Amino acid sequence: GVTFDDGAYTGIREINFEYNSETAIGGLRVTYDLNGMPFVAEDHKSFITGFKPVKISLEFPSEYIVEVSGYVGKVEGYTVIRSLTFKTNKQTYGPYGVTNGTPFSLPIENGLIVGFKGSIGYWLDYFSIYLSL
Amino acid sequence: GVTFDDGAYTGIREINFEYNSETAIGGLRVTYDLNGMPFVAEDHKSFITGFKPVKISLEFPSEYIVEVSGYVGKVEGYTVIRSLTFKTNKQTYGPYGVTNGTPFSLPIENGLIVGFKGSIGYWLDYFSIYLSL
Amino acid sequence: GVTFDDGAYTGIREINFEYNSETAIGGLRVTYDLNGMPFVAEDHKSFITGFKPVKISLEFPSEYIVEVSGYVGKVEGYTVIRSLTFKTNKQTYGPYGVTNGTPFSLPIENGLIVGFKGSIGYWLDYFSIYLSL
């Protein structure tokens, strides 16, 4: 797929991404906080359409992600992220996508997610998280 | 004067500031690096004019600031930064301004300057530096 | 079990831990690097014996862990870490324990593990990792 790297910022304000109950996670667009002001990063589009967008609007300062989890599996012969769950200190933005395959979880006891990088083709191939205090 | 706070970034690409051989440091404008791309921060202007601008263009990655120093003193009754010297791992951007008063220095053995904050009226009243690996 | 928290150090020199091919991971003792010299942390013992100890001696400076992974499952009704694999930039310290249950993994793209904390009763109940540049 097409690799992307948003780099690092000072926090997260909003996360928008696509998902399909029969396939996997699609495109991804993150709105970071950059020194107190919103910073809309590049939109990382899926090669295809037919997804169900979901917009997670966090109440920046008080609210932040404390855990990211989901499932990895094959779709059309490709290993991709099929599901995602974002747990914050306020609530859980329930499972989105297909929760089948191999589970993965990054619980954060202390620290903050300040960036995302990865790859997207037809679906989210993989991704990495920038962590910081 | 008017306070300012650029926040933190991933490095420094360019530093533009004003100085007067008879008074002190005037305005300041920093061009930071934000995840590989230039980010021109807000221009913090002096209340007045009659300064000599200086543009320190750093050869971002290979070149970075290893020490910031200068002189603090009074001008028209106000304690302000009167002189500044930026030393990098490649060269020294010689003293600019009036090198009289009380000296100060922030040499950096390990780490990077990734942001500036402070206040400016007719002259640079004071400033602080963001440090990070 | 009994909780423990070694805190943070400057690196990892050696990891000693028990495992049983029929149950799960037992006790744990880490020798960290503290500013260029070893620092043997407290031995976190299992309530029982009958384990097989493994001593991973990392060639400190040059060698460091790039991924920790394993399996989580039930033993006598308790959810514990049943298996562990430490991958360094030089080699993989093969699976130790029972590779059955829910997999988990912490791949590290950039950064270093500088400490461990968790809980141990009869077996390793859970554990967390300190990350730092």
């Binding site: 690092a8 989901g70 990895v72 290993t79 991709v80 992220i81 993965f104 990054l106 300040v114 960036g115 990088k117 990865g118 989210l124 191939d125 993989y126 991704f127 990495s128 998280i129 920038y130 962590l131 910081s132 | 970034y9 991933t10 490095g11 420094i12 690096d33 750093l58 971002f60 990655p61 290979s62 070149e63 970075y64 600031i65 990077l112 990734v114 990070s132 690996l133 | 790039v66 991924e67 993994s105 912490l106 791949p107 590290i108 793209e109 950039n110 950064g111 990350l131 730092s132 540049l133």
Partner: peptide, 14 residues
């Protein structure tokens, strides 16, 4: 070099 470093936790999905 003058590039600020970040902690990044390995990829999931590959």
């Amino acid at each position: 070099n003058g590039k600020s470093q970040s902690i990044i936790v390995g990829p999931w999905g590959d």
